């Protein structure tokens, strides 16, 4: 009765960071081993838990959030961070317990000419609460004149595209990202081996 990690990690397409995916994982036994000695990740940063010492514990739920950002922004997927991603797209809590796994995916998510299927929110009046998802596409009003859903001066479509090109420097290349959150409340239904 294994946990469906590969469905998340090995997806063909990953979500846009502003519309990030969340896989709810429950009623299963988790082999974290496939993750933690894997050799194909470039970032694997855990907070308050070790991936080794999880097989003893049992959780009510695990959440696996996934999206694509550029390499320079991977450092923002961490407690206490700020920046366009942490403030307006995906926010971890200050007391976040779990793991941020990331890996370069230039070979899959950039096209020659540019891959503009990946979007981020550039404009937002205030910061996301932790684990907030904002999929609004309302024209953003940068001055006092309301926009009436029409683009123009001080009236901006809030999303921008990444335009990933395989020749970009590593910091401007696409990275796939999975965030593992652990929640216990309820009966514990996600368990490590033994």
């Amino acid at each position: 009765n294994l946990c469906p990690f590969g469905e998340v990690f090995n997806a063909t397409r990953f979500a846009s960071v502003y519309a990030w995916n969340r896989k709810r994982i429950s009623n299963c036994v988790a082999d974290y081993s496939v993750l933690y000695n894997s050799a194909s990740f470039s970032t694997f940063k855990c907070y308050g838990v070790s991936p080794t010492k999880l097989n003893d514990l049992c959780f009510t739920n695990v959440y696996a959030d996934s999206f694509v950002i550029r390499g320079d922004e991977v450092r923002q997927i961490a407690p206490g961070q700020t920046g366009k991603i942490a403030d307006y797209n995906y926010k971890l809590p200050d007391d976040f317990t779990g793991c941020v796994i990331a890996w370069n995916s230039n070979n899959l998510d950039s096209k020659v000419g540019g891959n503009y299927n990946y979007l981020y929110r550039l404009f937002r009046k205030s910061n996301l609460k932790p684990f907030e998802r904002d999929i609004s596409t309302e024209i953003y009003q940068a001055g006092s004149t309301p926009c009436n859903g029409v683009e123009g001066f001080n009236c901006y479509f809030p999303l921008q595209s990444y335009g990933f090109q395989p020749t970009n420097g590593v910091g401007y290349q696409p990275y796939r990202v999975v965030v593992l959150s652990f929640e216990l409340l309820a009966p514990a239904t996600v368990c490590g081996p033994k």
Partner: antibody
Amino acid sequence: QMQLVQSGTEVKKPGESLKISCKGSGYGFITYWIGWVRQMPGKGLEWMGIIYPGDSETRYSPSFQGQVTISADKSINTAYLQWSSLKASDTAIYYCAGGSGISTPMDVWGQGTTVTVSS
Amino acid sequence: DIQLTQSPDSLAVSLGERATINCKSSQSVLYSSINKNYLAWYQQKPGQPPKLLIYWASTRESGVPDRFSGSGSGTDFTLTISSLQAEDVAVYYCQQYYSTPYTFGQGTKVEIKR
């Protein structure tokens, strides 16, 4: 299981610079943060600082802020501890220690590096 | 930040008897959201590096015999060696990893009582 190996014994005159190293091998290394612990002769253990080698995120202990430099080379799996100018008070054994995550116990320990600073 | 104090400073226990060591933290290390204490116990035999014995106040690390046990909550913790053996002579340290900077207790030397 992953294991840590440190560089060898060091004898130095006061005022010389010094850079000791700690290299990781085995499975799981991507998840490890590498801290540094000092044990002065006949004394206890002292947390100096910790680094995540995948991106050199570093956190010092207030006592050791400005005193030493913790760095990492992710390509050869190596953390480093270095002094620009050695006091004789720096005579100690330095352990590097690994925990797979911040707020995690130190699972893995190197064997120690003895450092004598004497005139 | 968080300070640790151990008691006693040194301890002498007959073979097969019980050793008790106490750790007191200036500040609670119970993380309420997951109900775990971020406290660890290490063992250092002479001339060897420290070895993790117990984590999360009461969880034995792999390979650690059942006679080692940890207990306590919040600010008061206890390491207990139930049937002291010859191999167990060592200095034992507690450590909080609730927040950086990490801090160690001063240490407790455990010698065989003859």
